[model samples]
Target: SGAIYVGNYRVVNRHLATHNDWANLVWEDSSRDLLVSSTTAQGCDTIARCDCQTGVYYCSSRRKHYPVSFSKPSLIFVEASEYYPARYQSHLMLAVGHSEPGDCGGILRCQHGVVGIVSTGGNGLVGFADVRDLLWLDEE
Candidate 1:
């Protein structure tokens, strides 16, 4: 051979969660921007983004899964306000899934928008349970 070259690259294991169970996780940055990701190991994995202001979450990436039964959906945000004079207000958003029946999704906006889904024999579809107050910013 006349010449040879080699290159190296770094790979980060950003795999949020591991297991065949349905799980949701959120990652918030200093700028208050959020990254949400979910995965149903034997089902599907989804990632979305939302602001702590309006509390509206949207999927930045299209989620595709095999086995036609797994589904994982989640939301991420920074600085969640309080509801009912509590600590923090819950965030809410929509969840879309695909299964043997058909492609079905719903809008799940909640006041205490915090919720989770567990894996079982059936598809665990979740959405906004309630929509109430907004997460406000602190004034110094």
Candidate 2:
């Protein structure tokens, strides 16, 4: 119910990327983190890719919950038939759906895996930064 303090675990390494309207944050394994309920070899059961690949995706957020102060996270179906492969300086993906203004950093997921992270949104379209373009962050 309170904020998830990642610093408490003392992350060994961290990487963040922000260019133009695209952004993402990644860090070394921190099992203490609570944001991810699902787990996998990749840790958070998420994958980074710059393409929507599919015609639809599911967005995770708390905007649908009742009341402003006591909202619970939920998922929204997004129709992403059209996408912008290079609208931003970094890897970018766009989806046609309803996402709140404050829903940045949320995960864009599909049955295949995580497609991208929420970065920008407007005019009934939600923009996301692809996860595939930032492998440089995990350099040796």
Top TM-score model: 2
Clash count, one per candidate: 9, 2
Per-residue alpha-carbon lDDT of candidate 2 for residues 1-140, written as tens digits (9 for 90 to 100): 11111212111111121231122233422111112111122333434343335534334454442111111122323332223232222344555666654455555555545444455556766655444443443232
- Candidate 1: list runs displaced more than 4 Å: 1-124, 128-132, 138-140
Clashing pairs in 1: 43-70, 44-70, 81-89, 90-113, 108-127, 108-128, 109-128, 110-130, 111-130
Error of 2 at 104 (Å): 0.4
The ten-residue window of minimal lDDT in model 2 covers 65-74
Candidate 2 residue runs with Cα over 4 Å from true position:
1-42, 48-52, 55-88, 136-140
Which one is best on lDDT? 2
Q: CA shift at 60, candidate 2, in angstroms?
A: 6.1
User: For candidate 1, which ten residues in a row score worst on lDDT?
Assistant: 1-10
Each model's RMSD to truth, in Å?
Answer: 16.7, 12.7
Instruction: Give the per-residue lDDT of model 1 (tens digit) for 38-80.
Output: 3222212221223222232222123432222212232423132
